[PDB]
Design a protein around this motif. Structure first.
Motif: not given
Ligand SMILES: [Mg+2]
Ligand SMILES: [Mg+2]
Ligand SMILES: [Mg+2]
Ligand SMILES: [Mg+2]
Ligand SMILES: [Mg+2]
Ligand SMILES: [Mg+2]
Lengths: 105, 87, 287, 129, 97, 250
Positions: F12-14, F40-45, F131-132, F232-238
């Protein structure tokens, strides 16, 4: 063979800015070297590895991303850390004469 | 220690021996073979020609279609005669 | 973040430090002690303490409310009524804008489901999708869309934007296959024929005013001109459009998928399509 | 009896995608449906509101007891308290009173009493989230 | 007198035997293995309640349905009686309606 | 030559990628052989210890099947006849010698049969738990990235001494990409150790991550985990189970 365990005590050297700027010149120049950005992995690794080898004290992974600038590196390396246990921290703290502390561990 | 090998789906088609009495009946019919073919392709070993109706099955299907699903012309004729009667 | 710095300061997170989020675990109430014991919240004697009070809806002998009301056919045949999931032009435009539905290719129920624009439940007597005029005044997408029902206004909006809309019928089996083709392809069965509409629905799908997929294409220009006249827009000649071929592509009335014929078997394992050649099978699958 | 062929393009066309596609580039915004991508570069505010996986603003109506109407700004990163101050400033003139809110600093959410989903969505769009 | 007069023999628990050490491994087999296997397939136990949960009445119905034919005669009789009793209890007794 | 890893997935840009020292097991002193950028979304959540608790309890309990069973008054042997008449005896009324009140009678509300405790958290919640856990290890300085798990020797004493020298915890969870490609030296070293546990990447879980003080990951494992968890982020409904074919899902 396991070498002697590295003591975690670390006292920042007096000539820390001079040593740091020497290392920065070795790795990377412009005025205000404090503000040099470490966005590059090569340069960050070179600087931090050199500093860790020289001072026997490396930047932990937790603080590693916070080293955005040489100023941040200087801040990290000019803060001391002592590895003495709480037993020492208490006993060598000018205990009043009526207070006695003993440790059986 | 070291972890035991991760559980994995049994590779390739699973063909139970029909002789065994404990093999479920749903695992012995043609539908099981068709699903195995869909899932594994040529590795299944299912003869592809078996996936289509055999001539007796085709005759049964055609009889059922004639019995229950009328043609568009027949539907339209029925609708027209019903409309004529209502009018 | 400052939270991660707080972690760096705090003791190691282990299985001895874990606590559920406060408010997520209500205390368990059990009948021991003064306040929850003795009669244990059941009252004093009678059927309610004995645990044997009459069934739900029993009113002590008085004719129950749910029985003294006359029977009326509110839900007669409910399970045989056809249901159509609504697809507003608002939702369609949203999907097109977010790229979940590609207007450059024909839009059918498969594409809608794949883009997750609609959820079809054939088992719950969903017969497909009905276009809904909601959002017509802001619809600005040129699309070739196939639906099961379509409101006059929705047709008008689709056509004014230079697109094409056709109402196509699907029996429950064909609808299931269309909505979820991959499971069907894993079933390993030849693609079945798409059945014709029931007699009651035949006039709807043979009427040109509905853009029925079984209607005479000769009458389509007249109907389109009538809608353009009624709703005050100039009918765009799609033949001149550079996507005219796409806008014209229509699956055969007995065809479920655009490029696949009835009777073919899709071997996804090795990326192949087996086609029967027996004359009887071919005649059956063409009929 | 059996004749294999490679017309598998018409099956690859039916295969659905597991990942949500990135929205296509549009010449003009806001898009006819009203959608607008977050501005680039991100705003320099102390806090950031990440878009939902659908690429929408994470502002949601909520209802409990059938009468408690709330609006939730959910995917907040940074100074949730700065966001709360900004939201209170933006909403007090509309209400006439400072709105009552809950800052879930853990989950990174801000919950406001009353329905303000549309206003907050517009406000976050203006701020460029 | 309902108190033992001697300390019980010490109970020594090896927190780092293989079972405890590898406990939980492959609980994310699905989300970390392209969903080839569901985590519930890791469950070892009675055939009729692998990857399933229910109250006692549902458990007994499932047990009878899935292994009822393989049950011993008196065990099956007890199960049928238990299902009957639980049906009566859950559908006719209770504070709530 | 430094071993530098960049983040393959879009960041992510931010957010800026977090960083870790890439280490090696080939020497007691090889504590810095490279620099890895971790998503960062996996190691800094956010530190969601409550989610950690949810996932840990799910892991502990969803496999649980308690086999405790007691006999009800119906199943206790005997107890058919009424012990004595209703009236005249001067004794309390009873209907069978196996009612719960009796010694040797049934248990009124006991554990009934093998009971499952099975339940599934949403897979998004479980992935968030992973992730956490990773973020917590990194933030608390218990996470160490290795270029590879290759050891100079298969002697367990070497591994223990290396951990002691590097001030790792009493317990180390080493993770390698796949079961087959794990180096023979590390396999031998960890086969004889109780607190040094070696698992494939597919076996990573919150429970073992928490049980072991330090978490050792290889660079391929880091890439693998980033990919799987960010998916898991950015996936549709199954539309249907992800085991079935999808357009873009391996
Ligand atoms: Mg009281
Ligand atoms: Mg009483
Ligand atoms: Mg009473
Ligand atoms: Mg709600
Ligand atoms: Mg008896
Ligand atoms: Mg007994």
């Amino acid at each position: 063979v396991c070498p002697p365990l590295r003591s975690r005590a670390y006292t920042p050297p007096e000539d820390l800015q001079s040593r740091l700027e020497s290392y920065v010149k070795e790795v990377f120049l412009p005025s205000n070297w404090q503000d040099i950005s470490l966005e590059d992995s090569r340069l960050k690794f070179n600087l931090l590895a050199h500093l860790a080898d020289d001072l026997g004290h490396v930047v932990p992974n937790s603080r590693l991303h916070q080293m955005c600038r040489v100023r941040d590196v200087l801040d990290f390396y000019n803060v001391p850390i002592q590895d003495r246990s709480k037993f020492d921290e208490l006993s060598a703290s000018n205990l009043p004469p009526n207070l006695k502390i003993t440790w059986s561990y | 220690y070291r972890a035991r090998p991760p559980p994995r789906r049994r590779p390739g088609p699973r063909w139970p021996d029909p002789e065994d009495l404990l093999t479920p009946r749903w695992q012995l019919g043609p539908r099981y073979a068709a699903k195995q073919f869909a899932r594994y392709g040529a590795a299944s070993g299912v003869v592809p020609g078996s996936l289509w109706p055999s001539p007796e099955q085709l005759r049964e299907l055609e009889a059922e279609e004639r019995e229950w699903y009328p043609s568009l012309a027949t539907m339209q004729e029925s609708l027209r005669v019903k409309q004529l009667a209502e009018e | 973040a400052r939270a991660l710095d707080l972690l760096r300061g705090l003791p190691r997170v282990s299985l001895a430090n874990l606590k559920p989020n406060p408010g997520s675990k209500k205390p368990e109430r059990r009948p021991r002690g003064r306040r929850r014991g003795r009669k244990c919240g059941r009252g004093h004697k009678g059927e309610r303490q004995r645990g044997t009070r009459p069934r739900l809806g029993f009113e002590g002998g008085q004719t129950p409310f749910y029985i003294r009301i006359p029977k009326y056919g509110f839900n007669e045949g409910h399970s045989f009524r056809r249901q159509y999931k609504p697809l507003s032009l608002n939702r369609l435009q949203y999907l097109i804008d977010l790229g979940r539905v590609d207007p450059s290719q024909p839009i059918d129920l498969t594409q809608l489901v794949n883009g997750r624009g609609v959820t079809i439940q054939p088992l719950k007597r969903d017969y497909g999708v009905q276009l809904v005029e909601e959002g017509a005044d802001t619809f600005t997408a040129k699309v070739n869309i196939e639906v099961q029902l379509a409101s006059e206004l929705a047709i008008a909006a689709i056509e004014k934007n230079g697109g094409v809309v056709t109402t196509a019928f699907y029996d429950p089996r064909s609808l299931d296959i269309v909505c979820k083709p991959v499971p069907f392809f894993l079933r390993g069965q030849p693609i079945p024929k798409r059945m014709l509409p029931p007699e009651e629905l035949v006039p709807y799908y043979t009427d040109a005013k509905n853009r029925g997929y079984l209607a005479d294409p000769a009458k389509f220009p007249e109907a389109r001109l009538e809608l353009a006249r009624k709703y005050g827009y100039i009918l765009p000649d799609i033949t001149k459009d550079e996507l005219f071929k796409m806008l014209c592509t229509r699956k055969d009335p007995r065809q479920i998928f655009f490029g696949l014929a009835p009777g073919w078997v899709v071997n996804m394992a090795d990326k192949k399509i087996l086609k029967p050649t027996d004359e009887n099978l071919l005649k059956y699958y063409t009929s | 009896f059996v004749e294999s062929v490679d017309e598998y393009q018409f099956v690859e066309r039916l295969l659905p995608a597991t990942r949500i596609p990135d929205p296509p580039k549009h010449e003009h915004y806001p898009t006819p449906s009203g959608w607008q991508p977050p501005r680039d570069p991100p705003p320099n505010l102390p806090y950031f509101v990440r878009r939902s996986r659908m690429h929408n603003i994470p502002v949601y109506k909520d209802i409990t007891h059938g009468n408690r109407q709330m609006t939730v700004i959910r995917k907040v990163e940074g100074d949730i308290w700065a966001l709360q101050k900004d939201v209170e400033d933006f909403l007090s003139p509309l209400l006439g009173k400072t709105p009552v809110t809950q800052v879930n600093e853990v989950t990174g959410t801000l919950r406001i009493k009353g329905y303000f989903d549309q206003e907050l969505k517009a406000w976050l769009l203006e701020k460029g989230f | 007198i309902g108190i033992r007069l001697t300390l019980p023999p010490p109970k020594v628990v090896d927190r780092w035997n293989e079972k405890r050490a590898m406990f939980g491994v492959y609980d994310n087999i699905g989300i970390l293995g392209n969903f080839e296997k569901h985590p519930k397939e890791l469950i070892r136990g009675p055939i009729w309640l692998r990857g399933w949960k229910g109250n006692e009445l549902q458990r007994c119905i499932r047990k009878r349905k899935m292994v009822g034919s393989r049950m011993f005669a008196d065990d099956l009789h007890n199960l049928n009686k238990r299902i009957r009793y639980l049906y009566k209890h859950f559908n006719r007794h209770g504070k709530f309606r | 030559e430094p071993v530098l890893r960049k983040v393959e997935l879009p960041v992510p840009t931010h957010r800026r990628p977090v960083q870790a020292w890439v280490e090696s097991l080939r020497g007691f002193e090889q504590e810095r052989v490279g620099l890895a950028d971790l998503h960062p979304d996996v190691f800094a959540t956010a530190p969601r210890l409550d989610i950690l608790h949810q996932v840990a309890m799910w892991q502990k309990n969803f496999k649980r099947i308690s086999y405790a069973k007691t006999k009800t008054r119906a199943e206790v042997r005997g107890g058919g006849r009424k012990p004595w008449p209703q009236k005249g005896t001067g004794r309390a009324r009873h209907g069978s010698i196996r009612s719960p009140l009796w010694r040797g009678g049934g248990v009124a509300h006991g554990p009934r049969g093998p009971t499952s405790y099975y339940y599934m958290l949403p897979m998004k919640v479980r992935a968030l738990g992973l992730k956490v856990a990773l973020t917590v290890k990194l933030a608390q300085d218990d996470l160490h990235i290795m270029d590879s798990l290759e050891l100079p020797t298969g002697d367990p004493q070497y591994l223990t001494e290396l951990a002691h020298y590097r001030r790792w915890g009493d317990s180390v969870l080493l993770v390698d990409l796949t079961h087959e490609e794990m180096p023979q030296s590390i396999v031998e070293a960890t086969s004889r150790l109780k607190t040094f546990n070696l698992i494939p990447a597919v076996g990573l879980n919150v429970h073992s991550m928490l049980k072991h003080q330090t978490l050792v990951l290889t660079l391929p494992t880091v890439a693998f985990l980033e990919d799987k968890l960010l998916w898991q982020d950015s996936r549709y409904r199954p539309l249907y189970p992800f085991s079935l074919p999808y357009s873009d899902f391996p």
